[PDB]
Amino acid sequence: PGGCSCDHIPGGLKMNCNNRNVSSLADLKSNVQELFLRDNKIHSIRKSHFVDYKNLILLDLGNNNIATVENNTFKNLLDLRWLYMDSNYLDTLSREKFAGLQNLEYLNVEYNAIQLILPGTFNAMPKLRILILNNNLLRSLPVDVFAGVSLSKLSLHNNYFMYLPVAGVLDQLTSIIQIDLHGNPWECSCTIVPFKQWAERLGSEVLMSDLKCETPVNFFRKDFMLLSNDEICP
């Protein structure tokens, strides 16, 4: 209904519309808890699309062509805990776009074109525990971006970071148990030293992968966790 597989789980229907040629969201025929919309061709999502769905606990929008997301799109969605939005084309993230998600725990937005995260974007989802932001076009993070949430795992690898500000952005990262930061063009200079120290003051296994330098040329693929500060900045 219509043309998509359906089944119900205690105590909630599940909808499987994957690899089906789907242009928009308003083209369907509630008590729907799980909605699978992966590998389709959805250009954008609007408030109107999810007014009907208020019982969703899992919303998978993967490998779509989502370019824009209207403000207050997920406002009526309070049962939603897991939101997959990967391999889409999201330019920026704002607080207004994620309003309404109070019980969201896991947010995945990897392989997008995210170039900027607006201040207090993640204040919208207070119960957020896992944040996936890897493989994007990020080059900087705003102050107090992680102030609103207590994250256990964060994935920022494969972006375009050359440095990271500790005060206001990384110092507010508590309850951290896993963090990923690789494939990033780190520069070994006087600017990377504060980030180096924070990474050294981290837990033994909280850092998932080793961080290696990109510039200058003389420190190519060299773990700066081992290097001394005088080598980097005399």
From Swiss-Prot:
Keywords: Glycoprotein, Leucine-rich repeat, Membrane, Phosphoprotein, Repeat, Secreted, Signal, Synapse, Transmembrane, Transmembrane helix. GO terms for cellular component: extracellular region; GABA-ergic synapse; glutamatergic synapse; plasma membrane; postsynaptic density membrane; synapse. It comes from the Eukaryota. Residues 1-29 form the LRRNT domain. Undergoes proteolytic cleavage that results in shedding of the ectodomain and cleavage of the C-terminal cytoplasmic tail. Glycosylated. GO terms for biological process: adult behavior; axonogenesis; endocytosis; gene expression; homeostatic process; multicellular organism growth; neuron projection extension; norepinephrine metabolic process. Residues 184-234 form the LRRCT domain. LRR repeats lie at residues 31-52, 55-76, 79-100, 103-124, 127-148, 150-171. It is found in: Membrane; Secreted; Synapse. Expressed predominantly in the frontal lobe of the cerebral cortex of the brain. Also expressed in some astrocytic brain tumors such as astrocytomas, oligodendrogliomas, glioblastomas, gangliogliomas and primitive neuroectodermal tumors. Its main location: membrane. It is involved in synaptogenesis and promotes excitatory synapse differentiation. Enhances neuronal dendrite outgrowth. Can form homodimers; homodimerization requires repeat LRR 2. Interacts with YWHAB, YWHAE, YWHAG, YWHAH, SFN, YWHAQ and YWHAZ. Belongs to the SLITRK family. It is linked to Trichotillomania: A neuropsychiatric disorder characterized by chronic, repetitive, or compulsive hair pulling resulting in noticeable hair loss. Affected individuals may develop physical complications and often have overlapping psychological disorders, such as Gilles de la Tourette syndrome or obsessive-compulsive disorder. This is SLIT and NTRK-like protein 1. It comes from Homo sapiens (Human).
